[PDB]
Design a protein around this ligand. Sequence first.
Ligand SMILES: CC(C)c1nc(CN(C)C(=O)N[C@@H](CCN2CCOCC2)C(=O)N[C@H](CC[C@H](Cc2ccccc2)NC(=O)OCc2cncs2)Cc2ccccc2)cs1
Ligand SMILES: CC(C)c1nc(CN(C)C(=O)N[C@@H](CCN2CCOCC2)C(=O)N[C@H](CC[C@H](Cc2ccccc2)NC(=O)OCc2cncs2)Cc2ccccc2)cs1
Ligand code: HEM
Ligand code: HEM
Lengths: 439, 439
Amino acid sequence: SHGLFKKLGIPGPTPLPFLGNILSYHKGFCMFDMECHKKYGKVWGFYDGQQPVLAITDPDMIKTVLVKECYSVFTNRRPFGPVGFMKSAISIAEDEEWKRLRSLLSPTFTSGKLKEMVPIIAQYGDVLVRNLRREAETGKPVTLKDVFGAYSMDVITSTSFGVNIDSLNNPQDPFVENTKKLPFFLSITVFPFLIPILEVLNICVFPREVTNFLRKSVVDFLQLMIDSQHKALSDLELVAQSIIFIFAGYETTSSVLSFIMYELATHPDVQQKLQEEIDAVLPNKAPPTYDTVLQMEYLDMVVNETLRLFPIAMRLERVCKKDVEINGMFIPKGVVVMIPSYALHRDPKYWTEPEKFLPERFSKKNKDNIDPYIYTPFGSGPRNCIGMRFALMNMKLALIRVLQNFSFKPCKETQIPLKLSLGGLLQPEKPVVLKVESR
Amino acid sequence: SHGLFKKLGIPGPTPLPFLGNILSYHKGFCMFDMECHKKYGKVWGFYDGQQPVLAITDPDMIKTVLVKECYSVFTNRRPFGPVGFMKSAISIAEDEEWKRLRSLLSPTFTSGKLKEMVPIIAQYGDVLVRNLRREAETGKPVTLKDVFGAYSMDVITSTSFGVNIDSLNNPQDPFVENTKKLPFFLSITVFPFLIPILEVLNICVFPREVTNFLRKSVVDFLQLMIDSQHKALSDLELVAQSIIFIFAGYETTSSVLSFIMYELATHPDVQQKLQEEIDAVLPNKAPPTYDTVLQMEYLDMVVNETLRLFPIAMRLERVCKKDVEINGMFIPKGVVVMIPSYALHRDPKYWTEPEKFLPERFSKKNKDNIDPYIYTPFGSGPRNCIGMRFALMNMKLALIRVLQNFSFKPCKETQIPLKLSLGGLLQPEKPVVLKVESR
Ligand SMILES: CC(C)c1nc(CN(C)C(=O)N[C@@H](CCN2CCOCC2)C(=O)N[C@H](CC[C@H](Cc2ccccc2)NC(=O)OCc2cncs2)Cc2ccccc2)cs1
Ligand SMILES: CC(C)c1nc(CN(C)C(=O)N[C@@H](CCN2CCOCC2)C(=O)N[C@H](CC[C@H](Cc2ccccc2)NC(=O)OCc2cncs2)Cc2ccccc2)cs1
Ligand code: HEM
Ligand code: HEM
């Protein structure tokens, strides 16, 4: 298959037998995407082992793939190794199975249901401040990843199961043992023929401890999914969607929050301007609500600029169902089409000083000079992030309460400039540690 | 997956882990189909390893699968182990790739093109008689499988490539060496996860000698396929369809002819009545033509009754693309639906004395008391045997010339009653040997 892109006339790095271009991932596939963008242009191809992958950076062509030709050609993502029963998760399901799960789960992420989840998940803001109050009296740096990981865990557990744990001060609740389990993954691309082997060996990507407990354990997601019971639902599928929410509500929410605090501490001018906006909207540590969170323009600008610098999905991907000719280029069946979000967010073409953290990019004035198909932190089209608004509301409620009571400064232990780990996840190379003061 | 049919309420034999019901194939899957039909009824399910297979015998439900719901749900067959480039063969291709190959190849099997192929393939009838004249003067039994295999090989080679070999008296032509290559196949069902392994090991089901020669070697099929050059064609695909024709034109044609002669020798009353019909239509060894072959009613009755007793495909199969409820029964996605042709052809319900060779079943009178979805020797629907009329014309031209000059009687070496081999192909357990006289 290594002669497909040279047959179609698409430029790209020459692949090695069996491996393809995977050795070029040694610097991280984000840097690989940037270098390929810099020397090839709007379109290039490469091989994850034997799998051809076509990268596209044209906004019109990206809209055609993510939106216009979604249900017909670009419906599904590229599958991974052993999935087990998680094949019924919405982010993994395909074609009409995904369409069914999308319809059953879409009302669960309504603005109305989100407005009902605000008074519940705000109670853990009072918990996060106290969990941050005690660790701030030490006078020594704090690992936000844990204090945020605790808060984020408290949210998914409460607004999906009513399990009101204090995850930090309770490493004992039966709903914290299993959640605690949320080199190999690269041997899948050289050996894609091994996936059917692991699907009969039942080696899932998780321990047997996790899924067996949640299967029995099976306003909140669990209710609203049982409330709305292609049209049909099942028992094991209910656990699959629950697992998909927990990883998202934990790893993504806490990672972005840690990224935001690093930018707020290393840019204290932005931090005060945010604290002053929060004070003018919520006088003297006033409790935030749904209606008042949407009122903070500069808070929305800070979150958007962090997600530009650190788009935790890095890439969007779709599998070509059939043959197609999109915006003047032929794409054969089986090719994975990929949108390099990280590279596009840092493209010197569309961005002035892309490496700079400049929240004013997303002010009401310039926000219009932003192509929604270059800046895609939540994807786009019928299969974008279904929990975008919940994620934005969750992180902002955390930032308001944390900044209403505390200020954040760097340390000798803080990694400046921050470097990104060269793994499969977009996260800091070393944990973000910051000096925490109070007011 | 072994709990699917008991969940849907469908009866069937209890499967063993890993194996499913494959041990029940020890008596041949034809007998397994008959026994399951006798004790379960219209519908039953079983497992080829982990693969659920649903058998159906209702004519209305069979028409729904083979015809009415073909393009939407039941488009493709059940794939096998390593296919290599043969995935582009029409009998193996899927969905829109098959639809494209079906359109490009359908005019090649037109009655008009067949009428043009008659004067060419009839010249080998003059060759078959001479190849049967010399072996008949021995006074010792003959193996029709070889004399027919020679004739059949001469036909595909001439009416697809103009390669006018005398395959019997020329084991030297470069077009006979490769064609000569036309336990393991059961290890595929217990280990379906090994197919992706063999697709990268490139171990095809053929030697490397065969495909490499035909790829370079690449009225007749080759012309008409290049003449008509989704709409597009390719080089390696041209060889794939050529290989699919050669196996069909050889193994099926000679096997049925051997089955016909066994029935004609063991029923000499049918043999004389056929010889008298041929004489009244073609006076004194007259040369047969297209228009005069269709004029022999009793010849058509003999061929149809042999194909009833020995339907060489044995089973028709379709893969369920989605979920469906057909003629009052729900079929989930992934289930292979199977029509047991051999069992239905010998069902005491629709057939009086099914084990008897009675050509009068297909007389113009009773031919109407025959459900076309119980008697399916060439399948039915958009994916039936595309070469049905060529196969019927080819075998009949062989029978006319062979019976215009010879008569056939059994021997001490003849296996009476004939037993079928318990392999994967429908062929005699031991070769059909018959005494050959002349006139
Ligand atoms: C190694 C390198 C060459 C890479 N190869 C890729 C290919 N590649 C885009 C993925 O498929 N990588 C997977 C991660 C696992 N590997 C490793 C790389 O090879 C095989 C696939 C990925 O993470 N994909 C998700 C699938 C589900 C994941 C994690 C998970 C797994 C099992 C059970 C539960 C969760 N997350 C998830 O449940 O979504 C929640 C979120 C919502 N919002 C942000 S996350 C599909 C997905 C879903 C949403 C957003 C993005 C992606 C990348 S780097
Ligand atoms: C062992 C037992 C449990 C069985 N499991 C099946 C499943 N099963 C219905 C098939 O798929 N078995 C294959 C035979 C190979 N195995 C063995 C069983 O497991 C895996 C599949 C079969 O023969 N299928 C054909 C595929 C192509 C074949 C032979 C061939 C293979 C490679 C290159 C070229 C030819 N023939 C063919 O090219 O067609 C020409 C004809 C036209 N007219 C009569 S033949 C699909 C097909 C096409 C036409 C008619 C019927 C079927 C059965 S018994
Ligand atoms: C900062 C937080 C988050 C970010 C940046 C993010 C980003 C993304 C992105 C880029 C995609 C892929 C969109 C595409 O391929 O077009 C995605 C998919 C998805 N996300 Fe998120 N996500 C976040 C949090 C969440 C949360 C909290 C949930 C649920 C509680 C969630 C649920 C999903 C699901 C289910 C999908 C797959 C949708 C489908 O396949 O139909 N995500 N997310
Ligand atoms: C006595 C001779 C033959 C018999 C009994 C026979 C029987 C069959 C049967 C039962 C099928 C499956 C139909 C279905 O699944 O609905 C089939 C398919 C097929 N046959 Fe034949 N066949 C014969 C000879 C031939 C010949 C001579 C050719 C070509 C030269 C041929 C080409 C094909 C093809 C291409 C298919 C697959 C069609 C598709 O998938 O679109 N067959 N045959």
